[PDB]
Nucleic acid binder design. Structure first.
Ligand SMILES: [K+]
Ligand SMILES: [K+]
Ligand SMILES: [K+]
Ligand SMILES: [Mg+2]
Ligand SMILES: [Mg+2]
Ligand SMILES: [Mg+2]
Ligand SMILES: [Mg+2]
Ligand SMILES: [Mg+2]
Ligand SMILES: [Mg+2]
Ligand SMILES: [Mg+2]
Ligand SMILES: [Mg+2]
Ligand SMILES: [Mg+2]
Ligand SMILES: [Mg+2]
Ligand SMILES: [Mg+2]
Ligand SMILES: [Mg+2]
Ligand SMILES: [Mg+2]
Ligand SMILES: [Mg+2]
Ligand SMILES: [Mg+2]
Ligand SMILES: [Mg+2]
Ligand SMILES: [Mg+2]
Ligand SMILES: [Mg+2]
Ligand SMILES: [Mg+2]
Ligand SMILES: [Mg+2]
Ligand SMILES: [Mg+2]
Ligand SMILES: [Mg+2]
Ligand SMILES: [Mg+2]
Ligand SMILES: [Mg+2]
Ligand SMILES: [Mg+2]
Ligand SMILES: [Mg+2]
Ligand SMILES: [Mg+2]
Ligand SMILES: [Mg+2]
Ligand SMILES: [Mg+2]
Ligand SMILES: [Mg+2]
Ligand SMILES: [Mg+2]
Ligand SMILES: [Mg+2]
Ligand SMILES: [Mg+2]
Ligand SMILES: [Mg+2]
Ligand SMILES: [Mg+2]
Ligand SMILES: [Mg+2]
Ligand SMILES: [Mg+2]
Lengths: 386, 63, 129
RNA sequence: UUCAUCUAGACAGCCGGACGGUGGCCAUGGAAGUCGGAAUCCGCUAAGGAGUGUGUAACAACUCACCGGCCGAAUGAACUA
RNA sequence: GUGAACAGCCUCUAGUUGAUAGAAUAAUGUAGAUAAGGGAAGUCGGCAAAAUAGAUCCGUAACUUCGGGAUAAGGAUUGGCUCUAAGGGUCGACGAUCAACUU
RNA sequence: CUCUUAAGGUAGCCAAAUGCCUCGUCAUCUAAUUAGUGACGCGCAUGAAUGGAUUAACGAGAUUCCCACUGUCCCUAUCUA
RNA sequence: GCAGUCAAGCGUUCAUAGCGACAUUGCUUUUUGAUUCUUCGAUGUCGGCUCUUCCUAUCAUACCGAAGCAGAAUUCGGUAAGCGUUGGAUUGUUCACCCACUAAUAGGGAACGUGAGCUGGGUUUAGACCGUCGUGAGACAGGUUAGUUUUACCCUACUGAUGAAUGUUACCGCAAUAGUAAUUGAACUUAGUACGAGAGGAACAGUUCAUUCGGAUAAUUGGUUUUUGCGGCUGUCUGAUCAGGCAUUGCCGCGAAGCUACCAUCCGCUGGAUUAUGGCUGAACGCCUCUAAGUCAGAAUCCAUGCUAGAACGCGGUGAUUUC
RNA sequence: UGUACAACGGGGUAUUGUAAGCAGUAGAGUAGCCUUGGUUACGAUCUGCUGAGAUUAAGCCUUUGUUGUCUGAUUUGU
């Protein structure tokens, strides 16, 4: 007989299977459509989620109840030191999809990216790319031949870039290497851009700008094996239930005489690849710029780092991207920020946000002071110091 | 933005921090955190709570 | 016309009557504009119009369904300016379906969202937040 | 299949006419061809119904049956499986 | 010892240290807890849980077989410390000496 | 007025743990009540030691409402072994 | 139970806007019967809770056609199951009924889905009471009260998790296939405008929010406390002090981290092809004709974009490949 | 054999709420003494040193300090 009271199904069947992502770095499965009149540019960037904070800004939304008023908003900080371009990959199109024809690497690779090709770096002889670097022996004839092949072919061009994880406070020391599509015209000049940027750094400010809508692609925080109640949001069974209540009561009818794929089951929760779109960049700040956390309204010379450091992360010392709201992935996780795949014009995008104040109170507690100088001024002199 | 003052402890309240309590008589109390909020609800006197600005002022601490 | 306010007054909640209509409390039986979800109680927030009965109060006002407007919540809710605020009690005022108050005076403070949503409540209100 | 129209011009198509006796008689507050009953007529007639519709409170007025101007050979109706 | 108490809790004498262990801390469990706002809307049904609770003082309705109901209902107080007052024995209207707790 | 029995259900009580019709009718209780209570009684099929009616007190008996209380629920979360 | 055909009539006129007698053709298996084919060395017997999926005879939402469609509202109908279809009082109840919200509170199937998922209020063991019946033991689709809900560790299914084999190993990728998701409302304005004698009274475009759902996240607020972190308190033990033990986490207040809440916040894409339908040209049938050839637009539909997984017997690029 | 790693230490951050000890013409009062205005003793508590003390990664941040560690086993060939 029928369900006898309608309810929406629990969970989204389009995010199946709820299995662990095959890699800790979520793959970018779609790049922005190529407009071949614009200059050559990366379609994405690699960063490390540092943590969240809060900002105050005047809302610009005519017709809204809070128009020209002050709104407090949550923001996520992504430590984004410049990425080192170390190679180029050419992609030809086939009746069976895109296919990598050849990859041309830079002559010199840093130990950061070399560690990525090693499970046991400490006891290896570090022979990686030693014979490849010999292709630059006298004139780089083989490198030029491969680049000529990429120009003659490879309707899609991607650069291989790696993070400078040594500039982050992470203990990993092993760089993250990824392919970033080169948008802009003339595959020939895509290859020229890649070759000219071999062994060179590209900063996040050359990829992204303020008020831009971007997408965050990351593996979510893992939670291990989870019951249906929290994995799918199913109703808790009554307290009277024998054999447990954090379950689904009926996991299927008599026919089909099988548990169906659509029924909520206990299993792995979190550590899933997610691509969340339309996150507005609130700041493109620079590590070399002190007063990173300052605004035109605050003028207090302070960095983006909260007092005591970002909890479980450390201090931001590099370029950083501050996006509105929250993004998938936990602190210290590698995330990929990609340009939006469409042109959003909705007055939520295209809104020019000007931060009035960035919170730098300690996230290790109920932080009361934005700066150590402010703590000094409020508290007065102490016994130890001050 | 304007930095508020804790009605109980006198600590600086930055935007989003703590809570705001509107009493029956429409008096407004701002608490920087749940510690001061809970002490106020317990009806403790800030003049007796040794870490508050009011206590330190009444006891001539720091000045 | 108003942002989402954390619902703190589900069906069956009894709030104080803040008007001078002679009612002492309002008993929530419904929330206007509330959605549908299995087992989910209709719940009201500050500024919402509810359907209510007078549990204690004037006998002429008791034993019937009437519109009411929530003017105090007592459940902490977040304003867009980042302020988490709450009242000491849940309170509402008897009104007609068009939002005009049955009483002529408000006792105690009134939420800004409720005052902005309902001009008659704002006109009869004293302290707003 | 059966019955019809047709080079003595079939049907369709465009345009002209579509009167007089006559607001025919009666029921209706008013009904003139046309909400309704009966009578189902002729003179002019190639031709016109006391009326095929639209329209009017009733009129008036368009419209079609009917006959014509033009083109020039097949066409129409009811049936059967 | 606390406490009205052979209650509960801690300790002395005496006895035991016996229940297969080690490492991790997923789901679901069994046992024990907490929870914003609402307060039975859950459910057959307040099931389960929570709330109350000792003692002192005040106050206590209907009904009643006058015996009860009754701890009705409903209130207030309670720590520590320093004191004050009252309540005795024995011996020779008073003196000497001795003494334990309850208010 | 009749037929009629041994006598024809008296005092009481009731949609009662006894009433089919029935979720009876009225009132109250609620926003809403096949529930509860108070009434009514041509009562399928109430009723007098097969005891009737009522009763203070008592009840791990059945039931309704109210105050307090709460994770029973809204709507779940967290912690310990 | 649902749907047709005819058309005497209703509909002021007018059979077919909407209906529709007398008749008649069907469909369905969510009624109840009929039967007794399966099961009596046993398929757990009501209802609810929970959860998934399916159907469409479509309540709502999308786009439309018709009206006795002026507007508003409404009615009939088409494509359409993509998407939603509720909170409660009484009752074990299915059913019913009422209150209320809502865009709507559509109807159903899945062994009258679902008891090694629950529950056990009812029916339907044994106790007991009443009424009627019986001489009686006892009977009662009559009422009432109490009444043990057992087992999975196997196989498969499902959910997640490893993994041999391809020379080895490592990095970066491709994408067959499978899944897929967003939903609905309100306010402002349009506009007191179109329409209408008036009463009343829209819609497109735009804006701000909200509902239901989903995926994340913990800056803030709240919850959680074995941080047994700090403080306080009782009883007792360590001669007193200091500092501690025990009270099965002794209790209380605060409590960082972590986890977590529409109790918090953030985010949830745009192209093509179509259905109904409305058209273009245009014969059939010198006219007419959206249709026959051809063709335009067009739905919450479909397929893509995008999103999830990555075939462990699909593929590509690239690095290093053992002196002994 | 290092912008190495670890264990401690330091600092920052955060939590609680002012440690022990000493002292005091603080202390409701009480009991002695004699030079009769003090002194001695008991005293919940109060005040000062003292926003002190304690804890702070166990999944906080940081570190010119101190101390130490850094070749064990198995297997893999086109
Ligand atoms: K059988
Ligand atoms: K917390
Ligand atoms: K102790
Ligand atoms: Mg349904
Ligand atoms: Mg969630
Ligand atoms: Mg059980
Ligand atoms: Mg924090
Ligand atoms: Mg907190
Ligand atoms: Mg329910
Ligand atoms: Mg004693
Ligand atoms: Mg609670
Ligand atoms: Mg509470
Ligand atoms: Mg209450
Ligand atoms: Mg209920
Ligand atoms: Mg219910
Ligand atoms: Mg019930
Ligand atoms: Mg109980
Ligand atoms: Mg009593
Ligand atoms: Mg009492
Ligand atoms: Mg009688
Ligand atoms: Mg009776
Ligand atoms: Mg009765
Ligand atoms: Mg009830
Ligand atoms: Mg009897
Ligand atoms: Mg069996
Ligand atoms: Mg079976
Ligand atoms: Mg259909
Ligand atoms: Mg069944
Ligand atoms: Mg089963
Ligand atoms: Mg069972
Ligand atoms: Mg069952
Ligand atoms: Mg039972
Ligand atoms: Mg029995
Ligand atoms: Mg008998
Ligand atoms: Mg011991
Ligand atoms: Mg202890
Ligand atoms: Mg045409
Ligand atoms: Mg065609
Ligand atoms: Mg594979
Ligand atoms: Mg340290």
């Amino acid at each position: 007989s029928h369900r006898k009271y309608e309810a929406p199904r629990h969970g989204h069947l389009g995010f199946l299977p709820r299995k662990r992502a095959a890699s800790i770095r979520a793959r970018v499965k779609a790049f922005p459509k190529d407009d071949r009149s614009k200059p050559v540019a990366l379609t994405s960037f690699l960063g490390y989620k540092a943590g969240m904070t809060t900002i105050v800004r005047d809302l610009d939304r005519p017709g809204s109840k809070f128009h020209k008023r002050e709104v407090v908003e949550a923001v996520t900080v992504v430590d984004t030191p410049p990425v080192v371009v170390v190679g180029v990959v050419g992609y030809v199109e086939t009746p069976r999809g895109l296919r990598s024809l050849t990859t041309v690497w830079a002559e010199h690779l840093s130990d950061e990216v070399k560690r990525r090709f090693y499970k046991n770096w400490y006891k290896s002889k570090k022979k990686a790319f030693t014979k490849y670097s010999a292709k630059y022996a006298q004139d780089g004839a083989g490198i030029e031949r491969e680049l000529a092949r990429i120009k003659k072919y490879a309707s899609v061009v991607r650069v291989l870039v790696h993070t400078q994880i040594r500039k982050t406070p992470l203990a990993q020391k092993k760089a993250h290497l990824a392919e970033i599509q080169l948008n802009g015209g003339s595959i020939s000049e895509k290859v020229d851009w890649a070759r000219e940027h071999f062994e060179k750094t590209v900063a996040v400010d050359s990829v992204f700008e303020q008020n831009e809508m971007i997408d965050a692609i990351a593996v979510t925080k893992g939670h291990g094996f989870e019951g249906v109640t929290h994995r799918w949001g199913t109703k808790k069974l009554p307290r009277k239930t024998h054999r447990g209540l954090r379950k689904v009561a009926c996991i299927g009818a008599w026919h089909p005489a099988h548990v169906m794929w659509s029924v909520a089951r206990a299993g792995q929760r979190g550590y899933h690849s997610r691509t969340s779109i339309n996150h507005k960049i609130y700041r493109v700040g620079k590590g070399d710029d002190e007063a990173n956390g300052a605004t035109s309204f605050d003028r207090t010379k302070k960095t983006i780092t909260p007092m005591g450091g970002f909890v479980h992360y450390g201090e931001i010392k590099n370029d950083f991207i501050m996006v509105k709201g929250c993004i998938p992935g936990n602190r210290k996780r590698i995330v990929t920020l990609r340009k939006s795949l469409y042109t959003n014009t909705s007055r939520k995008a295209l809104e020019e946000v000007s931060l009035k104040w960035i919170d730098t109170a300690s996230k290790f507690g109920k932080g009361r002071f934005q700066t150590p100088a402010e703590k000094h001024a409020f508290m007065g002199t102490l016994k130890k110091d001050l | 933005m304007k930095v508020e003052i804790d009605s109980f402890s006198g600590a600086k309240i930055y935007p989003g921090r703590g809570t705001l309590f509107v009493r029956g008589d429409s008096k407004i109390f701002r608490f920087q955190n749940s510690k001061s909020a809970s002490l106020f609800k317990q009806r403790k006197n800030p003049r007796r709570i040794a870490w508050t600005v009011l206590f330190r002022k009444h006891h001539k601490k720091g000045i | 016309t108003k942002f989402r306010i954390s619902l703190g007054l589900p069906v069956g909640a009894i709030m104080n009557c803040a008007d001078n209509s002679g009612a002492r409390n309002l008993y929530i039986i419904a929330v206007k504009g509330s959605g549908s979800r299995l087992n989910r109680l209709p719940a009201a927030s500050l500024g919402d119009m509810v359907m209510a009965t007078v549990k204690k109060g004037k006998p002429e006002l008791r034993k019937k369904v009437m519109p009411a407007i929530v003017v105090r919540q007592a459940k902490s809710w977040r304003r867009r300016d980042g302020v988490f605020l709450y009242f000491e009690d849940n309170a509402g005022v008897i009104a007609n379906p068009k939002g005009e108050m049955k009483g002529s005076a408000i006792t105690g403070p009134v939420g800004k969202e409720c005052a902005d949503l309902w001009p008659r409540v704002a006109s009869n209100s004293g302290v707003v937040v």
